Amino acid sequence: ASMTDQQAEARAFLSEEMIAEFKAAFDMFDADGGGDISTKELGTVMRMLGQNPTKEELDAIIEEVDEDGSGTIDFEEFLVMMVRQMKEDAKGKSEEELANCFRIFDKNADGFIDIEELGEILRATGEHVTEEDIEDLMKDSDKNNDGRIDFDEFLKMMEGVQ
């Protein structure tokens, strides 16, 4: 994927109203209406739009878009960077949430979800889960056959593809 390719993919990723919303904030820092903003303001517009790049990340993006020394970033490149940051931030939040789900599932905090903990959480959902269904989920997620689900196995169980 080239940058035009990446740009089309970034646009495909977003709804048109979100793209417009992002351009409204972006344009507040254009002024000159060139379709670009100073790379100095990139962090500020990304943060106004709920993203949280690190300073190192910003320096990396800036260096990636500013190889000609213009000191600016255009809106299309901006959208590629925003989508990269969204995917990154979303992933981090998911990881965080799964870690929290695991310590809640593991009621006795021994670092594992056993079939009784698995059984109690699944029944607590109100679903008509049978013991056989719970046993089937345990068997299929317990990769090393020790009868319990540790955090690595839980991440695989939950993320599924994983």
Interaction residues for Tb ion, span 76-115 (CB under 5 A): 106, 108, 110, 112
CB of 138 to Tb ion, least distance (A): 9
Pick between residue 9 and residue 146 the one whose CB is nearest to Tb ion: 146
Please state the separation of Cα 39 from the chain's center in Å: 24
| H or E element in which residue 90 lies | helix 75-105
Q: Gap positions in the chain, given as the residue before each gap (C–N > 2.5 A)?
A: none
CB of 136 to Tb ion, least distance (A): 15
**Which of 63, 116, 135, 146 touches Tb ion by CB under 5 A?**
146
Within the chain, strands assigned E span 36-38, 72-74, 112-114, 148-150
Pick between residue 2 and residue 144 the one whose CB is nearest to Tb ion: 144
Q: Is 68 labelled a binding residue?
A: yes
Nearest CA among 112, 104, 96, 100 for reference residue 151: 112
Interaction residues for Tb ion, span 114-143 (CB under 5 A): 142
Nearest CA among 22, 153, 28 for reference residue 86: 22
Known binding residues are 30, 32, 36, 41, 66, 68, 70, 72, 77, 106, 108, 110, 117, 142, 144, 146, 148, 153
Q: Given the rule CB under 5 A, which residues bind Tb ion?
A: 106, 108, 110, 112, 142, 144, 146
